[PDB]
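Repro case for the chain-ordering regression, as requested:
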Amino acid sequence: IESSGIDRRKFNRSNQAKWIDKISAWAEEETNSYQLPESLEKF
DNA sequence: TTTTTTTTTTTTGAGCGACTGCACTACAACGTTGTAGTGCAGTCGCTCTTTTTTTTGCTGGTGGTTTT
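-- result from build under test --
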């Protein structure tokens, strides 16, 4: 846990859990950008 | 095979990016609280060119406009 990393990441993981329902969509969630190793290491 | 009427407009920009406000936790100052950093959402500016390039048969040839 970093100072830039807020404790509301479980809400983003719950939003990503509701995203995996069907593959008919085309646009992914913005919160996947929270799960990047280039962004998590800098935070 | 015939025939009738009639004068009212509307609608239209959206993605990119910043400003500002409220919530939310991390961490140091004085268990608790104030300050700092970030996320999310409502509100708002802005801005979207320029232009020009061509061969065509004067009557090419038994052709041909006009009055009773």
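Ordering looks correct now. The radius of gyration of chain A is 12 Å.
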